[PDB]
Every structure is written in structure tokens, then in C-alpha cells.
């Protein structure tokens, strides 16, 4: 579980993200597809080319859900509850792929936030993402 400071850090790191979320989600998804290509099996419909506008908007939707999960950091299970079914009953993305997208997300915020990506905040953000993943993966079976 996230701690007071875990939350304080998370809220501060996503604070500076601001109106770059979409842009960050973008990259992150993009970092994911190039590095772990197996992840491309869920996006066969997509145009996964560099700069694809289809990635850009997916990017947005993903970073919005994260933004919102921070705004409910004390009630993530029921705030993401809807996104949880989706991934378990319609999409059905294997749970390993989550740990990969978190990784690419960290890497990203790390490239844009040199001032605030401190050890303490890296660790906090890692716990955060692990928690979002757990909720989204919680109703698989």
C-alpha cells in the first residue's frame, strides 16, 4: 500500500506532468511497442508507426485514467472499477504486459522530469503504477 509520502510524491510528480499527460502517454506507449514488441499483439487494428495519431489519442485516454486514479488515490479500486472489467472481460490482456507499460511510463517521466525524478519519487511512482496494475488485473478470474 501507498503511504502518506507515497501519495505526496505521486501527487507531486503527476502535478508537474500537467498538460503533457497525453504527450507522455504517447511516448510511453511508443517506448513500449519498440522495446517489447510482443505488446503489439493487442493493437493489430492500430497504426503503430512513429507519430501515429492513433497512438496519440490512445496515449491521452491512458494518461487521463492515470490522472484520475491519482485524484482518487484513496479509492483506486472503485474509481478505476470500470477500466478493470474492460481489461478482464473484453480486452483480456495478459497481466505481464502491465509491468512492461509501467516500466516504459517510468522511463518516460524520467526523461521529462529531471528535477523531480528523485530516488524517493521513483520508488513512490513504482508502487503507484504497481497498484494501478493490480486493480486493473484484479477481476481476471
Partner 1 sequence: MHLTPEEKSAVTALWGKVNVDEVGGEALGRLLVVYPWTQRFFESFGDLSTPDAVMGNPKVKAHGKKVLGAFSDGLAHLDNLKGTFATLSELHCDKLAVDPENFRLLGNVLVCVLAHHFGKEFTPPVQAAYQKVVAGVANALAHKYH
Question: Between the CA atoms of 85, 91, 93 and 95, what dihedral angle is there, to the nearest 10 degrees?
Answer: 0
Taking CA atoms, 94 is separated from 11, 56, 63, 89, in Å, by 28, 23, 20, 12
Scan for cell 495519431, then name that residue.
Answer: 53
* Contact residues for 61 (Cβ-Cβ < 8 A; gap 6+): 25
Instruction: Report if residue 36 touches partner 1, rule: CB under 8 A.
Output: yes
Task: Tell me whether residue 1 or residue 82 sits nearer to its own copies (CB atom).
Answer: 1
Q: How far apart are the first and last CA of the chain?
A: 22
Among 7, 56, 117, 133, binds partner 1 (CB under 8 A): 117
Instruction: Report if residue 7 touches its own copies, rule: CB under 8 A.
Output: no
- Residue 120 sits at φ, ψ, to 5 deg, of -50, -40
d(CA 19, CA 50): 21
Among 3, 37, 42, 139, binds ligand HEM (CB under 6 A): 42
Smallest gap from residue 24 Cβ to ligand HEM (A): 12
- Contact letters for its own copies, residues 88-127 (x by CB under 8 A): -----------------------------------x---x
- Contact letters for partner 1, residues 81-110 (x by CB under 8 A): -------x---xxx-xx-----x--xxx-x
Q: Which residues bind its own copies (CB under 8 A)?
A: 1, 123, 127, 138-139, 141
Amino acid at each position: 500500500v501507498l503511504s502518506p509520502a507515497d501519495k505526496t510524491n505521486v501527487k507531486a510528480a503527476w502535478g508537474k506532468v500537467g498538460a503533457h499527460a497525453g504527450e507522455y502517454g504517447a511516448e510511453a506507449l511508443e517506448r513500449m511497442f519498440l522495446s517489447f514488441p510482443t505488446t503489439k499483439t493487442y493493437f493489430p487494428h492500430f497504426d503503430l508507426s512513429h507519430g501515429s495519431a492513433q497512438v496519440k489519442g490512445h496515449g491521452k485516454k491512458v494518461a487521463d485514467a492515470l490522472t484520475n486514479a491519482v485524484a482518487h488515490v484513496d479509492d483506486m479500486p472503485n474509481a478505476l472499477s470500470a477500466l478493470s472489467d474492460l481489461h478482464a472481460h473484453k480486452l483480456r490482456v495478459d497481466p505481464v504486459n502491465f509491468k512492461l507499460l509501467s516500466h516504459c511510463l517510468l522511463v518516460t517521466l524520467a526523461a521529462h522530469l529531471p528535477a523531480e525524478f528523485t530516488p524517493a519519487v521513483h520508488a513512490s511512482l513504482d508502487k503507484f503504477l504497481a497498484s494501478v496494475s493490480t486493480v486493473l488485473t484484479s477481476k481476471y478470474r
